[PDB]
Amino acid sequence: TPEEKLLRAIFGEKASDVKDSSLRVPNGVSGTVIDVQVFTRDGVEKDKRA
Amino acid sequence: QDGTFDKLTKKEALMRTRELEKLENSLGGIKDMGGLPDALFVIDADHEHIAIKEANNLGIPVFAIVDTNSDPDGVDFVIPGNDDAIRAVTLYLGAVAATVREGRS
Amino acid sequence: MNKEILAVVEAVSNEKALPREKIFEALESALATATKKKYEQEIDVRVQIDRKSGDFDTFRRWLVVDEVTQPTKEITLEAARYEDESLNLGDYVEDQIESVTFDRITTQTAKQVIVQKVREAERAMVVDQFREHEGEIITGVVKKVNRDNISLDLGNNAEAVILREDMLPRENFRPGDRVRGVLYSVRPEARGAQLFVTRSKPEMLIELFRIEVPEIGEEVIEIKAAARDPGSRAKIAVKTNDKRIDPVGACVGMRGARVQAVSTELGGERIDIVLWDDNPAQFVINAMAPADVASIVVDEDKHTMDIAVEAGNLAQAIGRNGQNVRLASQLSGWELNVMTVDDLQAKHQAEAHAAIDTFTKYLDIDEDFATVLVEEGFSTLEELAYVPMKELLEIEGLDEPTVEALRERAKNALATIAQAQEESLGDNKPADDLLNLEGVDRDLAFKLAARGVCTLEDLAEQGIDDLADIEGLTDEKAGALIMAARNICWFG
RNA sequence: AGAACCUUACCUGGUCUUGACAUCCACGGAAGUUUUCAGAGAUGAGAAUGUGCCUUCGGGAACCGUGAGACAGGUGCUGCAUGGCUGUCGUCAGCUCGUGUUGUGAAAUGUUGGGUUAAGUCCCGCAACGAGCGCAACCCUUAUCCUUUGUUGCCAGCGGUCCGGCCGGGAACUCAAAGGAGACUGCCAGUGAUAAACUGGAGGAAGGUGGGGAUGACGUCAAGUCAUCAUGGCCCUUACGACCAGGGCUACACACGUGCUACAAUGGCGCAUACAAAGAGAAGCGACCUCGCGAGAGCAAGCGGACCUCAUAAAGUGCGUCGUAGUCCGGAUUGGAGUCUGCAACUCGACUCCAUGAAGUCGGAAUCGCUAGUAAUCGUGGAUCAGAAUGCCACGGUGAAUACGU
């Protein structure tokens, strides 16, 4: 819409990709996250948590 | 009042004021009155014979200050008296306007 | 990016006929609200959009106050003047903060605020358009039927409502039906329906007659009054200044065709058309149609009229459930009492006897002289006390001394009656005597006087036990009032 | 908006009829194509060769022949049975309606008058107040300017020049094609009833609707067309329908209508040379070179088009020259030799060469056109068209006189 098109001005993104949805995970189990591994194929920019 | 000089061309701008002006001085003072009148207070019934006879075709009660050269037959409530001078109108109109004012209560 | 802001403002301005300024003010408020939600603390935020570039700056602001209660939104005058010496109490200090990235979240908020402003201004335009048509018959299509109202579509995004009270009792509308009704109210409410339409009120009848009778639209015939029982029966009163036109005949039309068209639009409502008269009694006779009136007695003081009818016409004059008398009373503005000729005579004889008994009792006159006063039209002690002396002197056998004595007796009888009621309750006598004791309200004085305690002496003679049953009087308050009364009566 | 045949509806004569042409049904034959022909041709007698698709192969579609018919056909009569279309009063300013109003009424009033105008065009007055068809304005073309684009259009300043805008190159210019600016009594003065408006002036490319055009109010002639076509009747249907060859529409004591060419010296002939616009073009326009005195022919660029071609404009001018004559005026008519179109030029084409040389020497009664880039005069293009203009429709060159006035 005109308001979604206005993202080009301040944010800069052309059309925010094409659609919008964040890979969310399913249910059935609780837990406590004890250990996180991040492996990076060489050449790719490491983000701040890596 | 809002336009007719900037909405369109200047040729029709000056012209449509004349359509307003010629309609104002002859009709404009009756504009906000809907329906047939109820009493015509007339200043002269002689040269305005077409005025007094137009109400009798509609049964409106007429009031007219007539002179000796006028015709009393047309008007119902005939008021005799001089009405040609300017001084007589000062006594006439100011008095009869108050009679409608006491009726507006 | 830049030119895209201008293209969006131009597209929205042209499509919604809305001021660009109002859209920007709302986008600024939307972005300020979206910014406030990204901070954990309650901050105040101003956003300013540049009208040429579409670029926007975000400012956190603090209100300059004397005492700071909210450190997240308020700053002391001393601290504000450290940044700008020109600032006063009530001004704002502004810090430029990082403008929120225009993600699909801000985009959705901006869309919602635009849609809200578009609706607010579409609504203002609808109110301004329909304000000139207040009092007129509008035609709508039924969009939705609820239990309590009907929503009409008028076109051009204008919605009207008919309330349940504004409908006829037997009407059943379906979505897609066409409905006519009078626009009787335009409300500039920020939420809800703005246009209120009626089919039940008298204005619907008046405007249907204006459309169906050209002589009413041309102001040749005037509707003076309308009384209505919606979907059952109505009465209209018509006048004309043109003696060549029958106003009733014009409203009925050829074989009733005009009145039947109006009746059909109102679901078969029966319409009586009556001639307006400037004489109230003649107008009420006309309003009572189709019942024949035998006599009318007018009570100007009570604004009531007693209507005598023949015993055969009584049921017609009252009508089904009193509908005819009620519609005539609403049309005339008078309270109308319908009775038989025999009942009216019996009522007048009972009133005359009650007036004679009152005059004999209070004026110390004989029954023969009291009868003469009633035959001359005097019914009350007030009339005899206050009427001009000339009218009393027109009565055969009254001289100026006897009229003066009669007026003095009438005034004294009125004073006696007033004093009696003022001592029976708490109007004046007990509102001064019994209420002398400090603490006596007017209600308590009337409660005391209802027990026969009318004076401050009567209260001084009471025990606490004699007053214990008076609602709102405690034994302590009773004891205090009796002692106050005794202090004034016995020790003053 | 163009009759040699065709056209063509007419005449002489040769032929044919459910047919020149259409829908429907029956059976055969594909259709098609080539050839010999009877005869003036039509039509008819034939003779070869081919015999394609769908396959419901016991039949449809495409198409020819034969037969029966119901019909088809008619430029045959009625324009006063009519539609459509069109002419004219006249691009004159007029023709009416609604409601109110006056009169018994038919009707009148409005639209009448004082002014003014191209104009019931506006203005004022008015028992009338508004509305509609017209007038005007809106549309097209031309009148100057700015902006966009720059080819096949153009050449100012810029280099090479077979010195041709031909070639680099340039974007202002002419020109081109789109959109706007602009002229509206807008400004001034006098006049005029402080009206409308008129007569001058200013600025302006243009000034009083700038010029031209389209546009044609109710109705009038019971105008014209039945032959464009459509169509009620009426009538023919071995016919007034149909097919072919040839003729006629062009014939000729005579009168009128409309033009062309002239009667000459601001004129004719010869030589040299200047200046257009617009339009047309594919079984069509035709360079160039070449044979040809000429009309044209041969080979053949380019161009289904701002480029190529028709297409090298005429008076004008400069000069020579004739010398008021029926003559270097005029050229009708007539004989001979040819050019192309087309099956065909005799009745009955245009054109060309050589020869020929008429009437006519500015026109009586009477009558017509035209008020400006008009009259007059000159040359060009186009539709029609195989071919066939002096006509009609368009274009531009040159360029007047007079309008006291009713």
mmCIF file of C-alpha atoms in Angstrom, chain C residues 110 132 150 163 203 210 231 308-309 314 319 424:
data_model
loop_
_atom_site.group_PDB
_atom_site.id
_atom_site.type_symbol
_atom_site.label_atom_id
_atom_site.label_comp_id
_atom_site.label_asym_id
_atom_site.label_seq_id
_atom_site.Cartn_x
_atom_site.Cartn_y
_atom_site.Cartn_z
ATOM 1 C CA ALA C 110 0.459 4.035 9.291
ATOM 2 C CA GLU C 132 -29.242 20.640 4.427
ATOM 3 C CA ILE C 150 -31.972 -1.067 10.796
ATOM 4 C CA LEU C 163 -34.099 2.848 15.586
ATOM 5 C CA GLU C 203 -42.690 14.638 10.430
ATOM 6 C CA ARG C 210 -45.885 17.700 1.060
ATOM 7 C CA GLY C 231 -49.158 2.330 11.987
ATOM 8 C CA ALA C 308 -70.500 16.457 25.473
ATOM 9 C CA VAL C 309 -71.656 13.877 22.921
ATOM 10 C CA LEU C 314 -69.699 8.287 23.049
ATOM 11 C CA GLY C 319 -62.435 5.604 19.908
ATOM 12 C CA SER C 424 -51.597 20.922 59.129
#
